[PDB]
Structure formats: structure tokens, C-alpha cells
Design a protein around this ligand. Sequence first.
Ligand SMILES: *Cc1cc2c(cc1C)nc1c(=O)[nH]c(=O)nc-1n2C[C@H](O)[C@H](O)[C@H](O)COP(=O)(O)OP(=O)(O)OC[C@H]1O[C@@H](n2cnc3c(N)ncnc32)[C@H](O)[C@@H]1O
Length: 425
Amino acid sequence: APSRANTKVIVVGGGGTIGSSTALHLVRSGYTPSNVTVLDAYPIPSCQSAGNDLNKIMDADADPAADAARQMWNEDELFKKFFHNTGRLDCAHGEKDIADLKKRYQNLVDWGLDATVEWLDSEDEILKRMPQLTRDQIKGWKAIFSKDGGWLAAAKAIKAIGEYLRDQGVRFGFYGAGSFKQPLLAEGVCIGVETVDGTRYYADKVVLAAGAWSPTLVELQEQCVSKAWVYGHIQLTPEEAARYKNSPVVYNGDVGFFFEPNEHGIIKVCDEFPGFTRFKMHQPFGAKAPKRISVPRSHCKHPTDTIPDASIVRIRRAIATFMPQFKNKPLFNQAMCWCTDTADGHLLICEHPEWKNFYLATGDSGDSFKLLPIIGKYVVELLEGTLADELAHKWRWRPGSGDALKSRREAPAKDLADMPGWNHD
Ligand SMILES: *Cc1cc2c(cc1C)nc1c(=O)[nH]c(=O)nc-1n2C[C@H](O)[C@H](O)[C@H](O)COP(=O)(O)OP(=O)(O)OC[C@H]1O[C@@H](n2cnc3c(N)ncnc32)[C@H](O)[C@@H]1O
């Protein structure tokens, strides 16, 4: 077995979140960069990566991995400039949701010494934090304001990792040269990969970090089920955008959520719902015949696609609620953004059970962008046999462990076949 410095690694989906983090940690840990090969369907930051976004939410999760990531977002010189510590305002209306919000302000006294949070008990209190909100729209609302957290400039952070890797001498292959087709196997050991154009790459270890594409590329036995979420954007004038500078992330689980305008004056608005599948017949490597599997419908591959009409209605309601003064702005650059759910919502980070030296690093479950800085550390630990037992178990190979179509969400995802308005072919 080669020394670390002579060990060759291929990261499939290295243009995305987990895959770029993995490449970075291989470099940071003392792998020789020219021994590391990033393969992606699209150049880093991949156009179709779920991390290719103006913004994501950084919450205040107590989990050890999330806390390790939060520290890096605050202190790591590669990542720090992309974390915007604006705070988050979580709003609720009606006795059911206000009951759950109250409960939750008590999970935080209990679980993680509060004082990093405020209860807001009236319209007046919320308006003091977020004065751009409309009083009559928030009649009867309560909120929790969390001081830590905020948002992450997601595309820029992956792009910064790519620039770092390029400058270190990491090898890249994109498009036909980067699109995984199959592993190369010799006597049950993975010795590299082949891409759709027939290019072969040989390495000691292969990481499959293909996000929502992972269950399309190899047979995962429904451990992961791929689903899309949706957003649109509105353009503010400089004067309008100035009013929202450093605004918290604003969220109401019955409505949706929105972010501070970017440096171009654009606000992204998002729905809140259990995701959409797009089932069709497909044959991953290792499947003996085609199967009905949820296969991403990639906005990058089909840039005339939008989102479902149902999704537009929901986003419009979010704008009518949160920003009634902007109800006439067109919602543009509507897109679907793919992730893959496990049954329990934990990652799938494990060696393949039959293909030695092939490792899965997926199962993102819609909440892993905030792990970008840290997650490749764990992947490297997996490759090196040093991953903590609890995590090796939590992230294990586990077909038959529950229905990922519902996962731990409120309902089984609906399918795009049944949701008109996104396909303009
Ligand atoms: C879609 C979404 C996700 C999301 C979010 C809102 C939306 C609409 N809000 C979040 C938030 O507020 N906070 C948070 O922490 N996360 C949030 N997310 C989730 C997050 O985006 C995802 O969990 C995470 O980014 C997933 O990362 P992963 O690395 O698993 O997936 P990826 O970034 O999409 O990268 C996969 C890459 O694989 C490449 N690919 C695909 N096919 C191939 C082949 N054949 N060969 C090689 N590479 C391939 C893709 O191109 C992509 O780069």
C-alpha cells in the first residue's frame, strides 16, 4: 500500500459540496495534489451542484460536526468571508405553530445555553428586529431571533475551494471527461473509474460524492431517494436593497423564507415543502435491469426549465406575506435544486460493500451545505480507517432501513410528472 504522499485518489462529484470538501481535506492532510483527481459533469463550482447557490442558511445546530463546521465558517481563512452572521428570525402564527415555537425556545434553554437567542412576543418586537416587515401581515406572529448563524455565500465558497485546488496542482476532468459511467474493478477491488467519453482514470481510492446523482450512478437499493427544492429571485433597486442590508434570514415554516439581497440587489425566496421526485426508468451500474428511480432533472442541462406552478404560487404567497410592497416584481431565475434523502436523514459515508476502495459520500438529506468546511475531514478519515465508530455506524451502508421517499419529512415527496409548469420543452 502506498504512503499517503504516493496515494492516488479520485473524487467523483468533486465540483460539488462534499466532493470539493473532500479534495480540500486530502490536500490539507498531506496527499500530493497532483495525485488527486476531481471529476465532475460540470467545472467547479458545478452548475448543477446543490451548493451552486447565492445563499444557504447557516443554523445553530448543537451536533458535533455542525459545531466543527461553524467554527471553520467563523475562523478558517478560506471560508470565513462567505459566512454572513446576520442572524435568523423564525416566525410562527396560529396556536399549533406558536406552541412548537415556544417548545423550541425551551429546547435551547435546556440543550444549548440560550442568551444566543431572544423570544419575540409581539408584532412590535419583531418589527424592531426586522422593520421592513409589514405590521398587518404579521398580526399575531411570534418569533425566535437567533444571533449566531445567518447565511452562507454557497457558490462563492465552492468556487474558492476550486481556485485553491487548481493552484495546488489538483487534476481535473469535466464534461465527457468528468461524467462518471462506471468503476473499474479487478478481482472485486475498485482501481479507478471510466467516464461517459471512455476516459479512464486509475487510483488507489475512489470517492463517489455525486449528490442527488449518486443513486443514478451506482445501485444504492433505495437508501437514497433524490428530490428537488425550488426558489426564485426578485430584483431590488439600490435604494430598496439598502433597506434590507444585513437583514436576518427570515423564515416561517408555514410560508417559506428569504435572504438579504446579494451585492447585486437580488433577493432569493424559497418555499417550504417536502421536495419533488422525478421518477423514470434508469439503470445504475450494478443494477441488472432498468429500475424506476428518482433521477434529477438538471436545470443546467435543461436551462429552459423553471419550477412547478404550485411552487410559484407558494413563493408568491411568501412575497405577499413578507414583502407585500414587492408583489409586482417578476420572479426570475426560477430553478430546481437537487438533494438526496436517506430514510433517517443521516449521511451515507461508507465503503462500498462489494467494491473495495470505492467509497460513498452522499445522503446529504437537504441540510449539508453548512458542513462544506468540515465534511471532507470525515471522508478522509473513512479512507484512512480512522473514522469514529459512532459516525461509521450512523453513516453506514443500510439498505432496507426505512422509506426514503418520506424520510423524516412530513410527507412522501410528490413527483414532477404530476406537477405542471416547470417543463418548457
Ligand atoms: C437544493 C437545496 C439545498 C439546500 C438548501 C436549499 C435548496 C433549494 N438550503 C440549505 C440550507 O439552507 N442549509 C444547508 O445546510 N443546506 C441546504 N441545502 C442542502 C445542500 O445544498 C446539500 O445538502 C449539499 O449541498 C449536498 O452536497 P453534495 O455534495 O451531496 O451534492 P452536490 O453539491 O449537488 O454535488 C454533487 C456533484 O456531483 C456531480 N455529478 C453528478 N453526476 C456526476 C457524474 N456522472 N460524474 C461526476 N460528477 C457528477 C454534480 O455535478 C455535482 O457537482
